[PDB]
Design a protein around this ligand. Structure first.
Ligand SMILES: CCn1nc(C)cc1C(=O)Nc1nc2cc(C(N)=O)ccc2n1C[C@H](O)c1ccccc1
Ligand SMILES: CCn1nc(C)cc1C(=O)Nc1nc2cc(C(N)=O)ccc2n1C[C@H](O)c1ccccc1
Ligand SMILES: [Ca+2]
Ligand SMILES: [Ca+2]
Lengths: 177, 177
């Protein structure tokens, strides 16, 4: 009994597979502007946050003030937000960012006593969710190239630094190959 | 590996548990009107259609012309539609009706070759989805009393007659106990 299997297939089949094909185009179009204006550039991939603690806030800035809302991404109806990642008050990167909503279900199940679903169970299923979604995106046409999973366990931490590490690695890969 | 487990928990935790508490109130309020006007009454439970063939049309009338859109249910934002069930052109019942959207995921997976998910698999998981959702609603507070699952296999059929059978049984139970 692994709720993560169905959660990952539902998230892919019912959302990612539908939104991702439009995204590269929406982002390029925006980047004409962003460039001419702030000489900036938004990464072309959807960055999906996968906190293993299944903590999804209503606004990213609350999880880290160095993650600042910049703009809504226009449509070519799906709402997607571009954020700037700050270091010492300076813009260090920009990207389309959002949390994987299925993790909220895992959180809610761990607080729903009738489910018999412990915090240990929640963590196990959050990891399984990440692995399954990775497997799906690996076999998937282009979708894998249109997004990046950012999974992290917080100790008992800077989310903006984690995202910047990925953005910088993404650029490195782009220019070296 | 059973995607139905996660589909059913996600459908409950992320939708049914959230909508059902408002529903009895929305329906009672509407029924003041419906009564004073057409001397009719809308059943107080959400009827969820669970076709085991995972065929979900964009409009109910296409699955059966004796299922006719009547009105949108007002809010106390969730969109819910009241339908009239016809027999020989006459109104025989009314209820809030909708398909269980997770079955669409099962359908899409059966057409997504990379999933390795056959029609046999789809049927097996559609049944498991129904059973799991029933189990969840059975342990759930009031939610079980605020909705009714209508699961059916179509041969190789009148959907309105299936729904009316349930509505009439529901009334019988109400008046006898
Ligand atoms: C069903 C897919 N899924 N499975 C799991 C598990 C988690 C998700 C998921 O995350 N879904 C989802 N993400 C969305 C993002 C936006 C946006 N970015 O504006 C808008 C709607 C979004 N939906 C909802 C979807 O369209 C829908 C389904 C049924 C009925 C109405 C709507
Ligand atoms: C996530 C829950 N789920 N799991 C499976 C599996 C199927 C469903 C499902 O059916 N979901 C759903 N049913 C909806 C009905 C209405 C209406 N009747 O207006 C509006 C939104 C509705 N959603 C979407 C939900 O709000 C949402 C999730 C993530 C992001 C944005 C929205
Ligand atoms: Ca956290
Ligand atoms: Ca059918």
């Amino acid at each position: 009994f692994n709720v993560a299997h169905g959660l990952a297939w539902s998230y892919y089949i019912g959302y990612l597979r539908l939104i991702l094909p439009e995204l590269q185009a929406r982002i390029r179009t925006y980047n004409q502007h962003y460039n001419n204006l702030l000489r900036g550039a938004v990464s072309q991939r959807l960055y999906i946050l996968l906190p293993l603690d299944c903590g999804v806030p209503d606004n990213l800035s609350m999880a880290d003030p160095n993650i600042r809302f910049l703009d809504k991404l226009p449509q070519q109806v799906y709402s997607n937000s571009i954020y700037e990642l700050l270091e010492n008050g300076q813009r260090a990167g920009t990207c389309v960012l959002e949390y994987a909503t299925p993790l909220q279900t895992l959180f809610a199940m761990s607080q729903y006593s009738q489910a018999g679903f412990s915090r240990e169970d929640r963590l196990e299923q959050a990891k399984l969710f990440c692995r399954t979604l990775e497997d799906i995106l690996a076999d998937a046409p282009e979708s894998q190239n249109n997004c990046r999973l950012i999974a992290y366990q917080e100790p008992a931490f800077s989310l903006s630094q984690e995202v910047l590490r990925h953005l910088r690695q993404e650029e490195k890969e782009e220019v070296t190959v």
